[PDB]
C-alpha cells in the first residue's frame, strides 16, 4: 500500500490526536499523555486503511519539562534513524528496495500554540533543526481560540518570524498548471488554522465543537483551514511530499554519510 | 485602598487583556513584545504600572506587578527566582521601616494577591505550574486562573476545572481560601458558596464593546455573562476579597517571614 509516514510536532493535548482521527475520518489509537515526563520522546503506530500504511509518529511528552534543552535529540535521532535504515538498505549487495519498508518520515506537522503573538522559542530552535531532515507543515493548533481578527496578525507574525530566519517550510506543487491556481491560494493560507473535532452536531451529522454561544464547524472554510488541509491527502501532493523527502532531505543526510565513510 | 496583584504565567494567555478588562483601563502602553530569537533565554523581568480607579464608591491605587517572560524560554529553570526576590524584598522594606524610628508614612508595596494563569490548552498542570506554586503558595495569596476559558466547552471546562484541582490536592499547594461566612445574609451565602463550586476560575478577557465580549463567525462570546466565563466571578471575588487579602499578607505571611528572618 501507500507508505505515507506523518510526523505530529505539538505540546502535550494541543490535538495532535484529535485531528488525525478528524482528518482520516477514522479513530487511531489515542491514549493522552502526562505533562510529567521527563524528556520528549516519540511513539509510532502503522495503520492499514482506507489503501495506505499510514504511520503515525507522535510526539510525547513536548514542551512540558521544565528544563526543555535537549528536547530535540529524539525527534533528529529518529528521523536520522529512518535515514540511515534506508540508506543501509542500498549498501547491502542482495538488497530488496520494492519490498523495504520505508519509514522515512515524508510531513510533519507542527502544532503552534494559539497563544496569538508568535512562535515559542522551542518552535524556532525546533524547526531550524528539522527544516533540512523533514518536509514541514505549520499549523495553529485549536485554531477556534482565536478571532479572524487576530488569527490575520498571526499568521502574520508567524510567516515573518519563519523568512527572517530561513526556516525551509513546505510549499505544494505549482509545476502542474492544473493545480497552479488550487496550491497558490493553499501555500497563501500557511499556517493552516485548524480545529479538530471527533464529536458530531445535527445538521440536515457533522464534525463539530458545541459552544453555549455557537457551534465550530470542522468542514466549514470560514470557520476553519480543515477543508484546506484535508488537500494534502490527495495522491499527487501526496507524491511530492515523498518525492522531496528522497530527492533533497534524504539525499543530503546520503551525501553526508557517503563523506563520513570515505 | 492600596492594592497591588501580581500575574503570573505564559505569554500568550490573554493576561494582559483580562487585567484590562476587569477595571477597563489601559496599563500596557507601547508594549514591547519580542520575537523568539530573543526569548530564547530571556530572563524573568518584574515591571510595575499604579493605576487609580472608583468601583462604585470604592476607589483604589491598584498596582499590578507583571512578570514578563515567564515560562517563555527554552530553559524555564529559575524562572521564579526572581519572583520570590521582589516578594521578600517588599515584606523587607516593610520589616525595615516598621522597626525604624520613623514610620509615619510607609509606601506598602508588599503583594497582596497572585493571579496565576493556566494554559487551557493542555490536559492538566504543568510541571512548571506545580514548582511555581509549591515554591510561592507560603508566600503569597496564589489564586489559580484557567486562562481562555473560551476554547473549552461545557464537557472540557468541568474536566479541567476537577483535574487541576485533585493536582494541587495531590502535591499539597496551599491557595488562597476565601473565607466562609457566618447567618449573616443568605444571598451573601449563595454568591460565595457558587465562587467556591467555580474555583478555578476559568476566565475570558475582552475590551471590545458589542457588553464586553469576543467576537467569531460561529457566535460572540459574552464575557460578563456568567454562563460562558467566570470572569463576573473572578472580578467580584477580587472586589469582595481585597480586605481578606491585604489582611492575610499583613497576618500570615509577613509575619511568618519576619519570624523566620528574625532566626538568621
Ligand atoms: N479548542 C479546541 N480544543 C480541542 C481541539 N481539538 C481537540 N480539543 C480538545 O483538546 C483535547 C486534545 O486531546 P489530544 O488530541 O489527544 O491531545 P494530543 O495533541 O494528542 O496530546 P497527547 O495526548 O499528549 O498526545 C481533546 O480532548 C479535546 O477536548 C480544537 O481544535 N480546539
Ligand atoms: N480565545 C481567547 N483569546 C484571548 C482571550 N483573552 C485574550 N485573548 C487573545 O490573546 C491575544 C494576546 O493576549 P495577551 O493578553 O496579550 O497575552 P499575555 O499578555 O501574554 O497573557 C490577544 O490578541 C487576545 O485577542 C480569551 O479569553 N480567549
Ligand atoms: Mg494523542
Known sequence: GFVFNVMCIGETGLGKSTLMDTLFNTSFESTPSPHTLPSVKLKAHTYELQRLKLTICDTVGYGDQINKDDSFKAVVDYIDAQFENYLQEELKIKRSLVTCHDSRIHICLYFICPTGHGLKSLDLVCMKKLDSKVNIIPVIAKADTISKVELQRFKAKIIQELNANGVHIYQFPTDDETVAETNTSMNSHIPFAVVGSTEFIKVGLIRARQYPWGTVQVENETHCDFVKLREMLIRTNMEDMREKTHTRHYELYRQKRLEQMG | ?264
Open chain 2, 1 to 264: 485602598f492600596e492594592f497591588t496583584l501580581m500575574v503570573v504565567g505564559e505569554s500568550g494567555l490573554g493576561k494582559s487583556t483580562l487585567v484590562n478588562s476587569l477595571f477597563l483601563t489601559d496599563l500596557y502602553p507601547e508594549r514591547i513584545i519580542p520575537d523568539a530569537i530573543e526569548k530564547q533565554k530571556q530572563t524573568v523581568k518584574l515591571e510595575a504600572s499604579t493605576v487609580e480607579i472608583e468601583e462604585r464608591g470604592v476607589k483604589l491605587r491598584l498596582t499590578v506587578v507583571d512578570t514578563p517572560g515567564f515560562g517563555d524560554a527554552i530553559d524555564n529553570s529559575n524562572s521564579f527566582g526572581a519572583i520570590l526576590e521582589y516578594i521578600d524584598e517588599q515584606y523587607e522594606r516593610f520589616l525595615r521601616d516598621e522597626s525604624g524610628l520613623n514610620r509615619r508614612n510607609i509606601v506598602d508595596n508588599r503583594i497582596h494577591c497572585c493571579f496565576y494563569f493556566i494554559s487551557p490548552f493542555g490536559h492538566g498542570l504543568k510541571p512548571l505550574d506545580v514548582e511555581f506554586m509549591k515554591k510561592l503558595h507560603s508566600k503569597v495569596n496564589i489564586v489559580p486562573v484557567i486562562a481562555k476559558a473560551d476554547c473549552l466547552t461545557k464537557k472540557e471546562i468541568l474536566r479541567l476545572k476537577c483535574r487541576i484541582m485533585q493536582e494541587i490536592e495531590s502535591h499539597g499547594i496551599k491557595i488562597y481560601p476565601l473565607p466562609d461566612c457566618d447567618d449573616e445574609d443568605e444571598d451573601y451565602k449563595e454568591q460565595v458558596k457558587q465562587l467556591k463550586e467555580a474555583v478555578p476560575f476559568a476566565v475570558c478577557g475582552a475590551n471590545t464593546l458589542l457588553v464586553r465580549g469576543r467576537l467569531y463567525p460561529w457566535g460572540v462570546v459574552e464575557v460578563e455573562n456568567p454562563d460562558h466565563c467566570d470572569f463576573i466571578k473572578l472580578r467580584t471575588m477580587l472586589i469582595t476579597h481585597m480586605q481578606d487579602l491585604q489582611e492575610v499578607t499583613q497576618e500570615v505571611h509577613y509575619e511568618n517571614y519576619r519570624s523566620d528572618r528574625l532566626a538568621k
